[PDB]
């Protein structure tokens, strides 16, 4: 049903600063960071490796607070 989340479009290594090429929008469950926030996430770092196809959750991004 409608809410899309940010999903990793490639493996994102631990401590990588996110770029736009790394983030796609997809309706997945459980729900992660809202896809509307992809602009806000560029150049923030992930604190763990995020495999291809993994939903980005709030606790995986350093400094994220919505």
PDB file of C-alpha atoms in Angstrom:
ATOM      1  CA  UNK A   1       0.000   0.000   0.000  1.00  0.00           C
ATOM      2  CA  UNK A   2       1.306   3.528  -0.647  1.00  0.00           C
ATOM      3  CA  UNK A   3       4.260   4.620   1.617  1.00  0.00           C
ATOM      4  CA  UNK A   4       7.640   4.209  -0.107  1.00  0.00           C
ATOM      5  CA  UNK A   5      10.924   4.053   1.790  1.00  0.00           C
ATOM      6  CA  UNK A   6      14.577   4.632   0.906  1.00  0.00           C
ATOM      7  CA  UNK A   7      16.154   1.304  -0.261  1.00  0.00           C
ATOM      8  CA  UNK A   8      19.836   0.785  -1.060  1.00  0.00           C
ATOM      9  CA  UNK A   9      20.430   0.723  -4.827  1.00  0.00           C
ATOM     10  CA  UNK A  10      23.941  -0.757  -4.350  1.00  0.00           C
ATOM     11  CA  UNK A  11      25.954  -2.124  -1.436  1.00  0.00           C
ATOM     12  CA  UNK A  12      26.846   0.881   0.717  1.00  0.00           C
ATOM     13  CA  UNK A  13      30.073   0.113   2.717  1.00  0.00           C
ATOM     14  CA  UNK A  14      30.276   1.022   6.435  1.00  0.00           C
ATOM     15  CA  UNK A  15      30.959   4.701   6.951  1.00  0.00           C
ATOM     16  CA  UNK A  16      30.259   5.760   3.352  1.00  0.00           C
ATOM     17  CA  UNK A  17      28.722   9.192   2.767  1.00  0.00           C
ATOM     18  CA  UNK A  18      25.480   8.589   0.836  1.00  0.00           C
ATOM     19  CA  UNK A  19      25.097   9.818  -2.751  1.00  0.00           C
ATOM     20  CA  UNK A  20      21.932  10.033  -4.829  1.00  0.00           C
ATOM     21  CA  UNK A  21      22.994   7.060  -6.962  1.00  0.00           C
ATOM     22  CA  UNK A  22      22.845   4.870  -3.826  1.00  0.00           C
ATOM     23  CA  UNK A  23      19.200   5.483  -2.954  1.00  0.00           C
ATOM     24  CA  UNK A  24      16.032   4.244  -4.705  1.00  0.00           C
ATOM     25  CA  UNK A  25      12.412   4.586  -3.572  1.00  0.00           C
ATOM     26  CA  UNK A  26      10.365   1.429  -3.098  1.00  0.00           C
ATOM     27  CA  UNK A  27       7.221   0.290  -1.218  1.00  0.00           C
ATOM     28  CA  UNK A  28       8.618  -2.195   1.273  1.00  0.00           C
ATOM     29  CA  UNK A  29       7.796  -3.537   4.752  1.00  0.00           C
ATOM     30  CA  UNK A  30       8.796  -2.749   7.374  1.00  0.00           C
ATOM     31  CA  UNK A  31       8.776   0.915   6.503  1.00  0.00           C
ATOM     32  CA  UNK A  32      12.148   2.735   6.741  1.00  0.00           C
ATOM     33  CA  UNK A  33      13.175   6.382   6.150  1.00  0.00           C
ATOM     34  CA  UNK A  34      10.455   8.007   3.904  1.00  0.00           C
ATOM     35  CA  UNK A  35      11.435   8.262   0.286  1.00  0.00           C
ATOM     36  CA  UNK A  36      10.628  12.049   0.464  1.00  0.00           C
ATOM     37  CA  UNK A  37      13.786  12.449   2.565  1.00  0.00           C
ATOM     38  CA  UNK A  38      16.333  11.167  -0.035  1.00  0.00           C
ATOM     39  CA  UNK A  39      17.517  14.838  -0.696  1.00  0.00           C
ATOM     40  CA  UNK A  40      18.116  15.333   3.047  1.00  0.00           C
ATOM     41  CA  UNK A  41      20.304  12.194   3.260  1.00  0.00           C
ATOM     42  CA  UNK A  42      23.007  13.066   0.699  1.00  0.00           C
ATOM     43  CA  UNK A  43      26.449  13.258   2.201  1.00  0.00           C
ATOM     44  CA  UNK A  44      25.387  11.795   5.578  1.00  0.00           C
ATOM     45  CA  UNK A  45      27.185   8.557   6.564  1.00  0.00           C
ATOM     46  CA  UNK A  46      25.808   5.133   7.319  1.00  0.00           C
ATOM     47  CA  UNK A  47      27.112   3.481  10.516  1.00  0.00           C
ATOM     48  CA  UNK A  48      26.977  -0.080   9.162  1.00  0.00           C
ATOM     49  CA  UNK A  49      27.255  -1.855   5.788  1.00  0.00           C
ATOM     50  CA  UNK A  50      23.910  -1.710   3.933  1.00  0.00           C
ATOM     51  CA  UNK A  51      23.517  -4.559   1.384  1.00  0.00           C
ATOM     52  CA  UNK A  52      21.858  -4.000  -1.991  1.00  0.00           C
ATOM     53  CA  UNK A  53      18.092  -3.999  -1.573  1.00  0.00           C
ATOM     54  CA  UNK A  54      18.136  -3.203   2.221  1.00  0.00           C
ATOM     55  CA  UNK A  55      15.719  -0.610   3.550  1.00  0.00           C
ATOM     56  CA  UNK A  56      17.528   2.366   5.148  1.00  0.00           C
ATOM     57  CA  UNK A  57      16.321   2.817   8.714  1.00  0.00           C
ATOM     58  CA  UNK A  58      16.778   5.952  10.943  1.00  0.00           C
ATOM     59  CA  UNK A  59      19.339   4.285  13.237  1.00  0.00           C
ATOM     60  CA  UNK A  60      21.618   3.344  10.253  1.00  0.00           C
ATOM     61  CA  UNK A  61      22.388   6.978   9.341  1.00  0.00           C
ATOM     62  CA  UNK A  62      24.768   9.035  11.508  1.00  0.00           C
ATOM     63  CA  UNK A  63      23.238  12.404  12.443  1.00  0.00           C
ATOM     64  CA  UNK A  64      19.732  11.514  11.050  1.00  0.00           C
ATOM     65  CA  UNK A  65      16.799  12.832  12.983  1.00  0.00           C
ATOM     66  CA  UNK A  66      13.473  13.604  11.277  1.00  0.00           C
TER      67      UNK A  66
END
